[PDB]
Amino acid sequence: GAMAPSYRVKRMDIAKNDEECVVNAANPRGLPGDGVCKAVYKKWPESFKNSATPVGTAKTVMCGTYPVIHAVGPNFSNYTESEGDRELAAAYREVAKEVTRLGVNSVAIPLLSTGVYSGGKDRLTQSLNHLFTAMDSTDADVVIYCRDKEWEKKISEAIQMRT
């Protein structure tokens, strides 16, 4: 574990992370996809061998010795708000189990279901609070990756609020 486990946020491409493993915002079919998923496919294509997994789950595939945790959040275009909320919380609980099992000291993580799976809604707070619920009991350093300047400020504020 990390000596003083922390949360941080950075505004940059998660494919350039400085952590011991990465969480992909995956589709259920293990396809190259779009957005974060397509950046992950370009950087770690070997990690897409048998990476298909259902919604609300995480499946880890090694690229060399570098772990890629494929986490499948719900597409809110297809799920009800209620069922989507349940699957989004579940995906993050499976990420926490994988990060623990791998014994890593740090993990790079995007906000699940906030891009093309958002159903056209702002889900920063919903997704970030499910991330905290799952990751708070882990001792890995967590580095959250985003692309938007206003999202960086809001994520940073939420981290600092808890202290």
Q: Which of residues 91-130 bind Cl ion (CB under 5 A)?
A: 115, 117
CB of 84 to ligand YX6, least distance (A): 16
SS3 state at 32: coil
Whether the Cβ atoms of residue 60 and residue 68 lie closer than 8 Å to each other: yes
Q: Which of residues 39-68 bind Cl ion (CB under 5 A)?
A: none
**Furthest C-alpha separation in the chain:** 41
With CA atoms as reference, report the closest residue to 132 among 95, 98, 106: 95
Q: Is 9 annotated as a binding residue?
A: no
**What does 151 interact with, of Cl ion, ligand YX6, none (CB < 5 to 8 A by kind)?**
ligand YX6
CB of 163 to Cl ion, least distance (A): 29
Q: Is 35 annotated as a binding residue?
A: yes
**What's the length of the chain?**
163
Integer Cα distance of 87 and 75 in angstroms: 10
Closer to Cl ion at the Cβ: 2 or 12? Answer: 12
Integer Cα distance of 3 and 17 in angstroms: 20
Q: Is 36 annotated as a binding residue?
A: no
**What does 51 interact with, of Cl ion, ligand YX6, none (CB < 5 to 8 A by kind)?**
none
- Applying CB under 5 A, which residues contact Cl ion? 12-13, 115, 117
